Design a protein around this ligand. Structure first.
Ligand SMILES: *[C@H](C)[C@H]1/C(=C/c2[nH]c(/C=C3N=C(/C=C4\NC(=O)C(CC)=C4C)C(C)=C\3CCC(=O)O)c(CCC(=O)O)c2C)NC(=O)[C@@H]1C
Ligand SMILES: CCC1=C(C)/C(=C/C2=NC(=C\c3[nH]c(/C=C4\NC(=O)[C@H](C)[C@H]4CC)c(C)c3CCC(=O)O)/C(CCC(=O)O)=C2C)NC1=O
Ligand SMILES: CCC1=C(C)/C(=C/C2=NC(=C\c3[nH]c(/C=C4\NC(=O)[C@H](C)[C@H]4CC)c(C)c3CCC(=O)O)/C(CCC(=O)O)=C2C)NC1=O
Ligand SMILES: CCC1=C(C)/C(=C/C2=NC(=C\c3[nH]c(/C=C4\NC(=O)[C@H](C)[C@H]4CC)c(C)c3CCC(=O)O)/C(CCC(=O)O)=C2C)NC1=O
Ligand SMILES: CCC1=C(C)/C(=C/C2=NC(=C\c3[nH]c(/C=C4\NC(=O)[C@H](C)[C@H]4CC)c(C)c3CCC(=O)O)/C(CCC(=O)O)=C2C)NC1=O
Lengths: 161, 160, 48, 193, 65, 48, 161, 161, 160, 161, 160, 160
């Protein structure tokens, strides 16, 4: 739940002392990179229905999985697969705006073995969808913002496998 | 049974069942029809075999009956004759089971210190089942009372 | 039934009928008294 | 005699000579001779049909490896690779190779060695780890052979996982989803927890 | 098949861990199937195997354990 | 309205209710030497 | 640890009575079909390495799970999975001979839902593979023993979940 | 959930094919017995307090499972036990009428073996109850429809055991 | 020997042999005259099977006979036939023993270690004993080949 | 631990030939005499306590070694010798069913000689006890089974001496 | 059939057929039930003969399915299994009729001019039915495979 | 890596980081820029290595490509170039890490059980990675091909 601000003032609360100059320097390291994230979080929010559109066509479409016998065959399953991908963009922008992958341990990595195993979701196609989604996102957002966003995409698929 | 003792021997070796073990189960079910004739024969002669083997028990060992012993009581012998019937409950099981596997965990495991606790002599039971064996070998034919008597005399030495 | 015939009369709605159902002693004996407390928070939250 | 009392007490968790009047008596005679060492008396006890009737055929193979380590090694499993070495031995040769791969280990002979009995190594007798602090003292209790679901592998794998889907207050606060009844995994009946 | 062995195995850790020292130069029957894992274990501690003599087993069979 | 993901394994991972969850049968077709052998006329009466 | 023989012994032991005629009918039913199971337990233990490379190649190979991301992408995890699946064929033919699924319940099926959720394997692909092991064995020992095998494969997949 | 028509659609949907001449006779065997099953259900429901009466009269009454040292003894536990036997019969009406045991595996066989160990009621008496329910039912409905009702009776008994 | 498996079973619990186990020996001894008659059909038709099952092998697996294979050349395939001829010889030990422990301690303890180094495909060896099974069972009577086919059958599964 | 079955297999393998005609006649010698060996075994397993009960009463009791000053004066020792004598009958039974002294050679003989002299056990008092016990079993089992009983009790009596 | 071949043998000599020829009809029809039992298990195992005898063919001779050969490609391999599938239909036809004459009147009049024109080697197509003979006799029992194998040998005898 | 292996050894003796492994690690990390411009050139030419060692394997082992072998057919021999694509991909992880614990945990520890379960010969991969080494030493310069060629030579020892 916490961010780079509320990890510093949580860890400096619990020692009992006030905010000191070793911890304010950690806040200024977040405040120097804060302007980079708000430009990064704006452009993904205007293209959330289009990053998902291209990345499904990057790795998922015209496969076994799109075809019958695969998993995303029925229209009912298909939309869901966009929707079960669209949380992975919205929660990754929240952790990019936070500067901490503490949202991602908390909202979007709880059942993520056990929901997907108890629904017939293949894990190995979701990890292949996400670095197909990371490549089009870092192309859309830039080289500098792409590696900060690239931590929180690779935080998800490492916890998902 | 002989099937489970073939399985848990072959489970500890973590292999499949050997064909040396697989003829053991195959010859078992062909001879299973003989021993279920014994189980109907022992069950129909149940009420006869208790009272006469206890009658031969009393003339051999009068220490259970007499005062100073345990069963000096008109209820206290009635639990003894049920206790002989509890063993012939088991003897007709292992004849069908083809082993002494129902003799083991229901009837013989804790009996050396169970009877030590209760005050009954464990040696005194070992002729009562033997007196049961001498009547049970009389009603049965000798090619079947040889094996049905062999389940008894396992339990005889296992008591003492 | 005195919870029930208020619904058959129309004097209460169904949402008031569920509340007057699960305040009875037969619901309280079955899922509150004979359970752990945070189990019994979760099970009434599961049913209703 | 009180050594071969305690050797049964270490392996079979209680004195089954006193309490069940049974134990293989030919092995004690080779033991009391000084013929076999105390390492061998454990190992020939571990391959006996008394052991596999008591601690191998009643449990899952993953539960046996956690249960054998509390018997012979005197400690819990410390690492998921150190579980996974011994679990391949159970698929290799079953029980007789698993007790062979643990009693002949260098973890055994450094600590117990040659002519002493295994003793369980609790807190204070040596330093204890922090990774498996929970299910080691829980394994050292007498209620250890009724934990049917395995302890270590359900949490050695869980440390690499994220937070598993359950109720927020533990797995015992999560009812089975049927039509009625409110059944619960009671944590004291069979330790799911 | 089993064969006795006289072996003296010092520990080289009892200075560090401070344990009760058990007095080696033992004699034990090790069986044939479990011996070379136990023999290699004498080499890891650097203990010296003095005498190995075949107790029972009749060396040269093809069947019979 | 909702159910716990461990509870969906209790409901729908049975033997009878698995064909609606994932693929199960995967029919291999007629092999191509069989369908090359038919006279593209599977029925004929008097003209036999 | 019970047989179909000894369960009829034990269920006629908790009541304390002797062997009734329907109990001997249960024992005469098992003795009648005794030689059928031993003709199957040879043939399945003959081809125990041939079925495990057939049912895996039927419903588990060339999917995404052998591809990276999935739970079969490792050679540690391919060889663990054949070790995970040799146990299901070996304990089934143990339970075929005893006529009782009590061996599967306290050797295989006790901790199997709880380890598989802990290690993060697909239960849905495992229960695919054991059901894929059904029609290979049904097409190997004939339809009579395979339908008698199918009560003990469908006790595994019922007990996984 | 699904029935004999929905499953053979869903068997032929996930292959991607149409309804071939290898699946129409699965429907034609269902539609031939379509008039047979509807007459089978309408004699179950007219006798549904007597099939559950005659089932317990051969197994549970006058035994010592209804003794004071017994499971059945308090009348709270009796009226549950008739009702826990009501729900085995009424769903067995459904699966015979559907032609597929999938409704049994969703609601009856949900967690029923793991509830019973958590309660302490015996399972070995329950298989004796339903197999006493099977011999009453096949005499009442008819030896044709008692055969197909006997499958869905024993499918519960396969799941309990 | 099925006798020796019973001795180590009864020695490991420090007890005598149960009458369930002695019924197995009594069925073994009275069938032992049948056991030698199984081997005399196979010894008298030893050269018939190996020349047949060589040609049964080399149609199903001619990757061996083609060059680059493990037994290429007529000096090598004579050694490949005596590797078959050992296994027909060993089965006649295992039939008359009753157990599979002469197949084990002679042939299949380290057979995945030897044939790994020797370069031959062990799946072709498991083909080869299966090619040896189909002709040798047809030479026996079908009742004797039910028991004798099982000692062939453990040699199939313990290969691969 | 080898058998007359296996030693004619082992002698046929140290040559390397098949089962010849001389190897047949050794085997039919075993199977002809094997039927009485099982019938000999059931009797000595039945009277395994009664034989040892009067074997000590013939030679051990009321002598110097059961007197004070003797060896067997302690109750540990008198329990040990009955434990020593029940093993000598049980292992000679194991030598009787195999028909060879190889069962008797591996287990019991390697440590009786040097440890009885280490523990002060009189071997020269032990040997007439067990060869009295070889006399009392021949009256129990019969004369024709008594001769091959007499050749392995001699083999113990030669190994002690 | 032998009924067709004996009517027209008696039609040219224009009299009723002899009881020496009628007894051959009587031995044909009384053994008629067994020859349908040979055929109806081959038709039920039709797909699991040709897929393996084709794969035993291309493994034994690789130049046919190799590129540059006649049967290269997934279409050409498929049509060079129908050329094997067609002969398995005629062998099941020859087994029912009892004689080789529904193969001689259908399958083997002009094969040496057919495959000379089509380009396939006639020596290689005689190898495939030899692979078909080694597959189908293994799927049949010990006694009945000899009478089925003679019609397999006539097909190899007509091409070679 | 080496840095894991230096910690894990020093953690087992429960001391601090030694002056020994302070200088193994420092010598590793000042060679860290040299190994990545070794490991880039493998990934920069991954389509050439796979194509050349794919050309080099199948002429050495023609039993694989020929029908009845495992990689036969255009879908199956595309997977064997993918089967070698992983092992080239793993070696670049081992060159960067400075050890073979990326090779060990991903591509070694269950290979022989897997490739027996797939039907491929295990030593035929051990020729192919050895053929993959012979085109990788022609890429690099001489003093780096001894370093990167040792990681190829580790993978041969895991197979055979
Ligand atoms: C008996 C008639 C004579 C006698 C015997 C006596 N023996 C012992 C002690 C031992 N005897 C053995 C021998 C064996 N143990 C075995 O398991 C086997 C193979 C089955 C054999 C041959 C051993 C190893 C011992 C030592 C073990 C122990 O003592 O527990 C004693 C006890 C000696 C003591 O001081 O403890 C005695 C008294 N004594 C007699 O009266 C007879 C001459
Ligand atoms: C990163 C670690 C890793 C390994 C080790 C691995 C092996 C691996 N090899 C496979 C197939 C294969 N691999 C081969 C390989 C070869 N054929 C030959 O004979 C040659 C010797 C050889 C390679 C040059 C073949 C033929 C198959 C297909 C097997 C089949 O489908 O029958 C498959 C199954 C198909 C699939 O991938 O979906 C796996 C999982 N996969 C991995 O992810
Ligand atoms: C005797 C009863 C019994 C069983 C069955 C059992 C299984 C068991 N399976 C394990 C792992 C596993 N089991 C599987 C199997 C699978 N995962 C998949 O993706 C496939 C769908 C499926 C097989 C086809 C895999 C891949 C692992 C390894 C996971 C890991 O190493 O982290 C482990 C952890 C040990 C290890 O990973 O080395 C155990 C203890 N234990 C037991 O005691
Ligand atoms: C179809 C979906 C469905 C299922 C699975 C269902 C199962 C079910 N059967 C139950 C109880 C019960 N089950 C029995 C069992 C029996 N009666 C006997 O006396 C015999 C021993 C045995 C059967 C022959 C008993 C006695 C109870 C009551 C247990 C108790 O109250 O303690 C309970 C516990 C309810 C309670 O006790 O409050 C549930 C949930 N109800 C459903 O709607
Ligand atoms: C029932 C009597 C009968 C026979 C005998 C028959 C033969 C026959 N085989 C043909 C083709 C063929 N047959 C083969 C067969 C083979 N190629 C090889 O090299 C192998 C040796 C061999 C199989 C083992 C091939 C490849 C063709 C296609 C010829 C081509 O496309 O060049 C064709 C032309 C296309 C067709 O109709 O299939 C005929 C008519 N047709 C019949 O109706």
């Amino acid at each position: 739940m916490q961010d780079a601000i509320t990890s510093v003032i949580n860890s400096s609360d619990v020692q009992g002392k006030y905010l000191d100059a070793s911890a304010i320097q950690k806040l200024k390291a977040y405040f120097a990179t804060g302007e980079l994230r708000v430009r990064a979080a704006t452009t993904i929010s205007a293209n959330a229905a289009n990053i998902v559109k291209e990345a499904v066509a990057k790795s998922l479409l015209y496969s076994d999985i799109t075809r019958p016998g695969g998993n995303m065959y029925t229209t009912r399953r298909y939309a869901a697969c966009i929707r079960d991908l669209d949380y992975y963009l919205r929660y990754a922008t929240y952790a990019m705006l936070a500067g901490d992958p503490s949202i991602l341990d908390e909202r979007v990595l709880n059942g993520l073995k056990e929901t997907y195993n108890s629904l017939g979701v293949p894990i190995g196609a979701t990890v292949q969808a996400i670095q197909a989604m990371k490549e089009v996102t870092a192309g859309l957002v830039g080289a500098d913002a792409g590696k900060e966003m690239g931590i929180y995409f690779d935080y998800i698929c490492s916890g998902l496998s | 049974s002989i099937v489970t003792k073939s399985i848990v021997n072959a489970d500890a070796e973590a292999r499949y069942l050997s064909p040396g073990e697989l003829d053991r189960i195959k010859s078992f079910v062909t001879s299973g029809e003989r021993r279920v004739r014994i189980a109907e024969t022992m069950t129909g002669a149940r009420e006869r075999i208790i009272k006469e083997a206890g009658n031969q028990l009393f003339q051999k060992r009068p220490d259970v009956v007499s005062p100073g012993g345990n069963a000096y009581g008109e209820e206290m012998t009635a639990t003894c004759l049920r206790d002989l019937d509890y063993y012939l409950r088991l003897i007709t099981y292992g004849i069908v089971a083809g082993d002494v596997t129902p003799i083991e965990e229901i009837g013989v495991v804790g009996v050396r210190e169970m009877y030590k606790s209760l005050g009954t002599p464990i040696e005194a039971v070992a002729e009562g089942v033997r007196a049961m064996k001498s009547v049970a070998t009389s009603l049965l034919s000798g090619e079947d009372a040889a094996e049905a008597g062999a389940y008894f005399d396992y339990l005889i030495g296992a008591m003492s | 039934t005195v919870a029930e015939i208020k619904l058959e009369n129309g004097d209460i709605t169904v949402r008031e009928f569920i509340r007057i159902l699960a305040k009875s002693d037969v619901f309280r004996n079955m899922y509150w008294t004979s359970l752990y407390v945070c189990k019994a928070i979760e099970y009434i939250h599961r049913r209703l | 005699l009180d050594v071969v009392k305690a050797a049964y007490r270490q392996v079979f968790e209680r004195d089954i000579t006193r309490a069940y009047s049974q134990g293989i008596s030919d092995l004690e005679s080779k033991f009391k001779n000084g013929e076999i060492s105390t390492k061998e008396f454990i190992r020939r006890l571990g391959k006996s049909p008394l052991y596999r009737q008591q601690f191998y055929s009643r449990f899952v193979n993953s539960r046996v490896v956690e249960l054998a380590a509390r018997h012979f090694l005197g400690r819990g499993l410390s690492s998921p690779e150190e579980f996974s070495k011994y679990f391949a031995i159970v698929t290799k040769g079953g029980l007789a190779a698993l007790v062979d791969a643990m009693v002949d280990s260098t973890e055994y002979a450094d600590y117990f060695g040659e002519e002493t009995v295994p003793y369980l190594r609790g807190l204070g007798t040596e330093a204890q780890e922090c990774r498996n602090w929970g299910p080691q003292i829980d394994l050292f209790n007498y209620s250890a052979p009724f934990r049917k679901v395995p302890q270590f592998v359900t949490l050695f794998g869980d440390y690499k996982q994220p937070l598993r889907d359950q109720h927020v207050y533990g797995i015992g606060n999560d009812p089975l989803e049927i039509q009625f009844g409110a059944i619960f995994p009671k944590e004291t009946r069979s330790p799911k927890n | 098949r089993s064969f006795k062995v006289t072996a003296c195995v010092p520990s080289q850790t009892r200075i560090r861990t401070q344990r009760e020292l058990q007095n080696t130069y033992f004699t034990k029957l090790v069986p044939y199937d479990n011996w070379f894992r136990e023999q290699q274990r004498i080499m890891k501690m650097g203990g010296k195997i003095v005498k190995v003599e075949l107790a029972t087993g009749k060396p040269g069979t093809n069947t019979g354990l | 309205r909702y159910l716990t993901p461990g509870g969906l394994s209790l409901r729908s991972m049975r033997v009878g209710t698995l064909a609606e969850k994932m693929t199960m049968v995967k029919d291999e077709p007629t092999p191509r030497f069989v369908e090359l052998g038919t006279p593209t006329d599977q029925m004929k009466g008097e003209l036999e």
